[PDB]
Amino acid sequence: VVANYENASMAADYIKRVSNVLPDIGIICGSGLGKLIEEIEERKVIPYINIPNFPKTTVAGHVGNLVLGSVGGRKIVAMQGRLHMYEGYSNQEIALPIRVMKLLGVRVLLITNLAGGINRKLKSGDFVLIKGHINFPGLGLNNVLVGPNQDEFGPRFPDLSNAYDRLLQQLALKIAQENDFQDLVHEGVYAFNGGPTYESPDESNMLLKLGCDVVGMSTVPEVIIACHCGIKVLAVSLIANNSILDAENDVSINHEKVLAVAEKRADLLQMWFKEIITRLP
Amino acid sequence: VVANYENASMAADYIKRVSNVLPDIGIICGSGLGKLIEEIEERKVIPYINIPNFPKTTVAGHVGNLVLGSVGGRKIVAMQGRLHMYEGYSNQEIALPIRVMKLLGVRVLLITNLAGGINRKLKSGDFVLIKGHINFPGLGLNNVLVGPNQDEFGPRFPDLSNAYDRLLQQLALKIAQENDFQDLVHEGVYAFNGGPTYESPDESNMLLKLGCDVVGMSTVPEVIIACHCGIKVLAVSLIANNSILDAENDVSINHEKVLAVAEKRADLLQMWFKEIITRLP
Amino acid sequence: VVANYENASMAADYIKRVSNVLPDIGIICGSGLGKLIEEIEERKVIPYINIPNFPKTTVAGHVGNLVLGSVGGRKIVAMQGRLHMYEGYSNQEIALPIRVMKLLGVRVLLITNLAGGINRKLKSGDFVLIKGHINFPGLGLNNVLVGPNQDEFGPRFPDLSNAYDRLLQQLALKIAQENDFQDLVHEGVYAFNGGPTYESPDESNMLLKLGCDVVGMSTVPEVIIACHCGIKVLAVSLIANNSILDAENDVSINHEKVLAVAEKRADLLQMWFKEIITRLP
Numbered sequence: 001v002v003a004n005y006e007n008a009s010m011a012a013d014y015i016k017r018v019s020n021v022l023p024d025i026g027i028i029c030g031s032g033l034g035k036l037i038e039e040i041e042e043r044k045v046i047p048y049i050n051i052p053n054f055p056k057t058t059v060a061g062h063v064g065n066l067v068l069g070s071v072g073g074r075k076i077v078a079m080q081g082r083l084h085m086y087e088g089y090s091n092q093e094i095a096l097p098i099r100v101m102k103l104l105g106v107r108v109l110l111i112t113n114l115a116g117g118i119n120r121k122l123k124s125g126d127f128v129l130i131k132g133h134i135n136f137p138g139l140g141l142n143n144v145l146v147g148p149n150q151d152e153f154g155p156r157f158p159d160l161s162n163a164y165d166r167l168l169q170q171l172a173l174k175i176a177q178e179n180d181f182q183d184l185v186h187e188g189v190y191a192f193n194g195g196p197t198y199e200s201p202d203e204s205n206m207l208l209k210l211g212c213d214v215v216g217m218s219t220v221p222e223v224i225i226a227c228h229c230g231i232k233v234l235a236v237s238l239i240a241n242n243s244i245l246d247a248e249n250d251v252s253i254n255h256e257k258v259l260a261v262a263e264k265r266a267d268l269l270q271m272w273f274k275e276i277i278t279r280l281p
Numbered sequence: 282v283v284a285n286y287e288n289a290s291m292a293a294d295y296i297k298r299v300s301n302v303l304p305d306i307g308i309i310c311g312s313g314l315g316k317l318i319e320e321i322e323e324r325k326v327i328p329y330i331n332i333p334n335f336p337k338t339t340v341a342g343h344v345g346n347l348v349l350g351s352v353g354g355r356k357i358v359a360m361q362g363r364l365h366m367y368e369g370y371s372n373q374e375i376a377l378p379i380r381v382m383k384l385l386g387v388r389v390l391l392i393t394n395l396a397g398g399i400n401r402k403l404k405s406g407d408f409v410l411i412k413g414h415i416n417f418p419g420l421g422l423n424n425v426l427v428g429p430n431q432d433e434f435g436p437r438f439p440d441l442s443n444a445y446d447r448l449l450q451q452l453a454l455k456i457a458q459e460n461d462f463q464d465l466v467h468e469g470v471y472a473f474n475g476g477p478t479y480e481s482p483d484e485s486n487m488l489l490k491l492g493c494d495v496v497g498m499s500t501v502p503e504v505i506i507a508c509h510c511g512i513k514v515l516a517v518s519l520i521a522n523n524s525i526l527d528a529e530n531d532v533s534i535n536h537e538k539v540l541a542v543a544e545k546r547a548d549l550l551q552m553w554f555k556e557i558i559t560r561l562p
Numbered sequence: 563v564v565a566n567y568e569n570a571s572m573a574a575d576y577i578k579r580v581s582n583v584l585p586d587i588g589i590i591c592g593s594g595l596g597k598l599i600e601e602i603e604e605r606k607v608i609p610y611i612n613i614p615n616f617p618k619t620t621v622a623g624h625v626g627n628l629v630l631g632s633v634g635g636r637k638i639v640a641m642q643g644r645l646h647m648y649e650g651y652s653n654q655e656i657a658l659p660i661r662v663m664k665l666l667g668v669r670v671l672l673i674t675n676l677a678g679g680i681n682r683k684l685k686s687g688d689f690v691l692i693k694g695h696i697n698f699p700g701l702g703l704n705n706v707l708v709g710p711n712q713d714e715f716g717p718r719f720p721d722l723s724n725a726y727d728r729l730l731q732q733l734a735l736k737i738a739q740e741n742d743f744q745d746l747v748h749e750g751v752y753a754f755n756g757g758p759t760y761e762s763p764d765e766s767n768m769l770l771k772l773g774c775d776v777v778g779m780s781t782v783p784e785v786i787i788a789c790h791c792g793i794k795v796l797a798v799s800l801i802a803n804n805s806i807l808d809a810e811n812d813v814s815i816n817h818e819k820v821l822a823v824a825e826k827r828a829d830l831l832q833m834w835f836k837e838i839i840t841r842l843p
């Protein structure tokens with residue numbers, strides 16, 4: 001199933017009939033960082049498997065729902081259970097849910113992820129406001145837009161220089177200052193590692209030389225689809241570890257340690273994003 | 282359809298029956314840089330869709346013809362409407378037209394493209410004679426030669442150290458000097474970005490550190506297929522912008538601006554390549 | 563055919579019925595470096611084409627056998643005829659033979675390859691004990707583990723920081739010292755170039771800047787599958803040339819020259835690996 005105008009329209013039609021919500025904001029939340037979705041008011045949960053043309057996710061299993069409702073008086077749509085390219089989903093499967101968001105009325109997309117720290121100033125538990133990226137899959141002929149262009153959504157050759165909205169970064173930082181946690185908030189450049197293996201010690205050393213501040217396995221595909229169709233983006237990484245220090249000390253990373261950092265910061269991130277949603281222009 | 286000896290032979294047979302031209306030179310021209318094709322003498326236009334085993338191009342649409350005839354007393358074959366890998370064409374679809382050129386008798390391939398400038402000496406409107414490349418798709422398991430080797434055309438493991446003929450570069454520069462436009466002509470290393478998004482500001486900064494002079498989304502696949510089967514290559518980039526300066530000044534690039542640079546230099550490039558064709562050893 | 567638990571089990575069942583050997587050690591040998599396989603004692607040769615669920619290799623042709631028997635009193639299984647990703651084999655085809663080794667009882671995998679030298683200390687004929695890697699395909703969305711995770715074999719997100727066992731490196735060096743050829747033995751970081759074109763002169767210059775000591779077209783996929791399922795690895799590169807010196811002197815590389823270096827070092831490598839097998843803890 002191609003992520004074209006007709007197929008996205010069929011999915012949006014189903015959603016509109018079932019939910020009655022016309023959302024202005026979309027959210028995609030990282031692993032262990034989804035508690036806000038359970039607090040959406042007057043909400044409606046729609047399993048992906050019920051929506052025409054949504055990608056099949058039963059090989060991976062686990063949760064996969066679209067959730068619509070209100071937060072802070074604002075109408076939102078959330079993806080609960082993200083699709084990642086290391087699972088084998090195609091370009092067309094990643095793009096269709098974002099293009100459905102566009103047809104539903106979404107103008108701003110807020111995204112969180114877990115990532116590894118490269119810059120020496122980053123510690124476990126820090127947040128990074130993403131200001132740009134290095135897209136190794138895109139340089140290497142695996143960009144999410146490889147294929148025919150869907151002209152109704154955007155241009156053949158997008159410019160990504162303003163993909164990460166500067167005013168949204170400034171609002172996120174302002175709110176951190178108001179609540180006295182700005183000491184945890186940095187800005188930086190995100191490297192996309194296709195995955196699913198964590199960056200090796202020598203890959204980490206290379207990324208330091210190349211100007212990367214953080215590295216992870218998600219987010220860049222969604223950012224590119226959103227920028228192509230005119231949706232503004234705020235993307236925030238939660239830092240699980242510093243991969244450069246770990247290489248110098250021969251210390252390992254694993255999914256258990258990552259999820260423990262997520263649990264440590266989940267409630268603060270929930271409060272922060274609730275306020276961002278409330279304050280969006 | 283595999284780009285093998287039998288399938289390439291069937292296409293060449295059709296072409297020979299229809300055109301009567303036995304070409305020694307092939308040309309592939311960049312977007313907005315194809316006016317020379319409309320001036321081929323005693324010419325024959327063959328739509329791709331009519332040629333056995335040529336790749337299907339109707340999803341992308343737009344022009345797609347093989348044009349044969351004479352320029353400067355020399356017999357040539359041109360591709361009008363290039364196939365680019367960001368459109369989703371496979372390795373086999375890119376390679377078949379170049380291998381048909383080989384069977385028709387082509388010994389020299391001349392290629393032009395539009396590209397972004399990385400080296401600080403490059404301005405919009407400059408030309409770069411390509412002397413080597415950095416093939417991000419090839420390092421990342423998307424080389425145009427991934428697949429079984431077609432032994433009739435070339436070896437399993439090609440050496441690319443002489444892919445860009447030095448004497449052809451020297452002839453191109455000599456002709457620029459004769460016509461007093463050598464101040465526009467540089468040499469440099471070309472980075473292949475799979476595309477279709479333009480290099481991001483932070484990707485541009487990385488490429489500067491890695492020794493890249495220019496970056497674009499084409500050319501390297503065709504060069505590799507030509508080198509594999511013993512065809513000599515001259516490749517020239519027309520510079521649309523300097524991506525490093527644009528990053529320092531927060532200035533955007535887009536296809537409209539690219540095509541305007543192409544229109545500004547089209548007539549000079551046409552005159553230059555006509556003389557190169559005439560003077561080839 | 564997916565490299566899952568059921569399919570790997572069917573292949574292992576066939577092998578066990580035919581060979582009667584329960585191996586503790588697996589070996590994968592580079593081109594021209596397979597003489598040790600012909601000296602396995604009380605051996606059994608099983609063509610890949612006869613084993614249920616093994617990948618089809620008839621397009622490439624050439625040899626493809628699993629060989630079981632004894633070396634130095636130890637039970638081993640060897641792959642004779644390696645599968646390389648530049649031939650077009652999928653992730654699932656590369657992984658299945660390694661996962662069969664795991665089900666047969668393999669705890670240690672020994673691997674050899676031919677590679678290009680980047681570090682200025684490396685000459686043709688030198689050996690490099692691999693201590694880490696830079697996986698360009700993995701960064702670029704072509705990691706061997708892209709796809710659903712096979713949970714019976716290992717975790718969704720592997721850590722590769724200890725993929726190259728330190729004690730096995732130390733044993734290999736100890737044996738070189740005992741036989742007075744330690745002057746040929748170095749350690750280093752291996753860059754994976756998907757291939758099949760040799761690294762270009764400008765790619766070589768880039769790899770020097772990025773901290774790479776050697777570059778080749780194999781090994782990293784097998785290492786990752788082995789690490790995922792808990793098999794310890796020793797990987798050794800035989801250096802065919804120094805690509806940085808060749809770029810400075812405009813000298814070419816080719817498969818003939820590579821195979822001549824293999825023939826020059828084959829007997830010494832055979833003796834070294836026989837002793838390593840005998841001495842493994």
Ligand SMILES: Cc1cccnc1O
Nearest residue numbers: 114115116216217240
């Ligand atoms: C998610 C993650 C955590 C730590 C390091 N690297 C990553 O990709």
Ligand SMILES: Cc1cccnc1O
Nearest residue numbers: 395396397497498521
């Ligand atoms: C064609 C092009 C123009 C300007 C920058 N980058 C590119 O790839």
Ligand SMILES: Cc1cccnc1O
Nearest residue numbers: 676677678778779802
């Ligand atoms: C196998 C090989 C030999 C020399 C240089 N590069 C390579 O990949």
